[PDB]
């Protein structure tokens, strides 16, 4: 917030500005030192931890505001040609999969009541029985009870908000006090949160029905993470000659993550891509919800280049972005072979045929949430060619 004292002497203003700059430098250095000590494992207290967390959150908010301002100044990082090529690839992938778009929720959806009840339950589970609840928390609980009282009216209000409310309120931002990797905690408005949760449940159900998310998208209810690791280990050895290095063959499993994948999500590209899958009105509503004014204490900044993880629709958005990224990385032919024919799709970490398993170096690939892992069994000639390249 700018400090404007037009009634103050110019030398007084200069002295105040110099003192402010010195104090800001000292505070930044102290916060960096305290964060380093906390990450290393130094001995601190609750007051020191609280002060360091507050200073780090303020610094992160200022840095995010500066990054958003620079993104607006520098424009979209993604070039037009690259964006067009990515959109063409995604369109080709969707057409090959023949994914019917998920329409807007009809007036007489068969499972609308069930989805609304599930969303209300999933939102209520956060509000555990504590000593008390804030006024906003009390209003949220009251709105949840009212929705559980009149499901039809609540669904009508949700639909009206989805089709009309393209400009939401300010979403709060707080940072979880993780010692190593600080993470944000974004709280949406109560009615906005309810609408987002209903939209997310509907989109997840529609995607499951239409098979939008691919099998290699790892986090699912079918396989828990430890069982996912066990299945990956079991299927790695299931490939033909997965260990025979006698002929010089070498197998390389690359474990990588998409750095700043959540942060570097172009809102315009997200709107242009989600419209190919989600309903155009629903996609526009989700894209608009992705743009909000992040408010925290006396600091308020806008968002234009990063999807908010707090929104209930983040799961579908992040899944679609990860699917697009995987299609770019895995390639059209490899993804098609890994997902099998549309009529009889293949299971996870499985190829339609043994010949189709050795059709390319990429054999096994599990696109976790912002964490890739591809197992490549490069032949001797293929490894030599890749090394030469």
């Amino acid at each position: 917030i700018p400090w404007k004292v037009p009634g103050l002497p110019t030398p007084i203003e200069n002295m105040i500005l110099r003192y402010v700059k010195a104090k800001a430098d000292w505070w930044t250095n102290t916060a960096h030192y305290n964060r380093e000590r906390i990450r290393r494992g130094a001995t601190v207290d609750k007051t020191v931890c609280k002060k360091n967390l507050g200073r780090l959150t303020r610094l992160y908010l200022k840095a995010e505001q500066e990054r958003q301002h620079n993104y607006l100044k520098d424009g979209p990082y993604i070039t037009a040609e690259e964006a067009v090529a990515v959109y063409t690839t995604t369109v080709h992938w969707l057409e090959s999969r023949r994914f019917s778009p998920i329409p807007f929720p009809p007036l007489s959806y068969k499972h609308d009541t069930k989805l609304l009840i599930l969303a209300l339950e999933r939102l209520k589970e956060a509000y555990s029985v504590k000593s008390r609840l804030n006024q906003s928390q009390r209003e949220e609980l009251g709105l949840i009870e009212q929705a559980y009282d009149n499901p039809h009216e609540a669904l009508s209000r949700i639909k009206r908000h989805l089709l009309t409310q393209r400009a939401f309120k300010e979403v709060g931002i707080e940072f979880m006090d993780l010692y190593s990797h600080l993470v944000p905690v974004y709280d949406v408005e109560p009615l906005e949160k309810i609408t987002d949760a209903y939209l997310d449940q509907y989109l997840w159900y529609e995607a499951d029905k239409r098979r939008l998310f691919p099998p290699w998208i790892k986090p699912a209810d079918t396989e828990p993470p430890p069982l996912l690791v066990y299945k990956w280990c079991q299927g790695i050895n299931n490939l033909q000659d997965v260990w025979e290095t006698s002929e010089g063959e070498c197998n390389v499993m690359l474990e990588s993550r998409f750095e700043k994948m959540y942060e570097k999500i172009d809102l315009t590209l997200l709107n242009r891509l989600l419209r190919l899958i989600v309903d155009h009105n629903i996609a526009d509503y989700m894209t608009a919800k992705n743009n909000v004014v992040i408010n925290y204490k006396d600091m308020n900044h806008t968002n234009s280049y990063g999807i908010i993880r707090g929104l209930q629709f983040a799961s579908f958005i992040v899944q679609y972005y990860g699917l697009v990224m995987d299609l770019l990385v895995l390639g059209l032919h490899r993804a098609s072979e890994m997902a099998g024919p549309p009529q009889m799709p293949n299971d996870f970490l499985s190829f339609q045929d043994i010949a189709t398993e050795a059709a390319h170096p990429i054999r096994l690939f599990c696109r976790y949430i912002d964490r890739i892992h591809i197992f490549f069994r490069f032949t001797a000639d293929e490894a030599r060619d890749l090394i030469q390249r």
């Binding site: 001995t43 601190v44 207290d45 609750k46 007051t47 020191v48």
Partner: protein, 141 residues
């Protein structure tokens, strides 16, 4: 800074202790040069406008008025002591004694809670107010 007016004269400080009776009188015997007394003064300034309606905090310099450091034996660099209507209330910190705080309390909430508890104990007349804190340990981990 140090907006709290330090009672330079020892007799002036004693009269100030006899001045207010319906609130809490806290005297900071720390010498203003040391950084620990600076942190104590900062903590007092944090609660300067909060506990004002229930307490009256004054600073003190043991070099200016030595009688307080020679009769009450306040040898700590910055010791916080209380006196309510000519009765030095004792805070049950658990540090062996209860005449002073002797610690640079950097938590404003802790100081506010201690002041409130001291006021409640003085109203109840308990010369040894049970401090709602585990001051016997460093309270850090």
């Amino acid at each position: 800074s140090y907006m709290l007016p330090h009672l330079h004269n020892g007799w002036q400080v004693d009269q100030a202790i006899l001045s207010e009776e319906d609130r809490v009188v806290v005297i900071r015997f720390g010498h203003d040069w040391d950084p620990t007394c600076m942190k104590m003064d900062e903590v007092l300034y944090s609660i300067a406008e909060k506990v004002k309606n229930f307490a009256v905090i004054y600073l003190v310099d043991i070099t200016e008025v030595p009688d307080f450091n020679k009769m009450y034996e306040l040898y700590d660099p910055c010791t916080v002591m209380f006196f309510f209507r000519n009765k030095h209330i004792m805070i049950d910190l658990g540090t062996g004694n209860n005449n002073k705080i002797n610690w640079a309390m950097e938590d404003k909430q802790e100081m506010v809670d201690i002041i409130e508890t001291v006021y409640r104990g003085a109203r109840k007349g308990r010369g040894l107010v049970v401090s709602p804190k585990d001051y016997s340990t460093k309270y850090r981990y």
